[PDB]
């Protein structure tokens, strides 16, 4: 028998974080030229975040 099997846990990668942060950060620097540095900083890290949310470490 080879039974299947579930995990509730997650992996992280440098390579998939390296270029989700470099293809938002890319995005609102092309489309919104008005946008100074500082809200580009603080919407990224905002929505990275907002999305994955850290409670414990």
Partial sequence: SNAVLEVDERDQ???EA???MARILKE???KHPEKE???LIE?????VLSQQQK???
Avoid: V
């Avoid at 919407?43 to 929505?47: E, F, G, P, V």
């Fill in 13 to 15: 990668d440098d390579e």
């Fill in 18 to 20: 390296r270029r989700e």
């Fill in 28 to 30: 609102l620097k092309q």
């Fill in 37 to 39: 540095i500082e809200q």
């Fill in 43 to 47: 919407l990224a890290n905002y929505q």
């Fill in 55 to 57: 409670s414990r470490a």
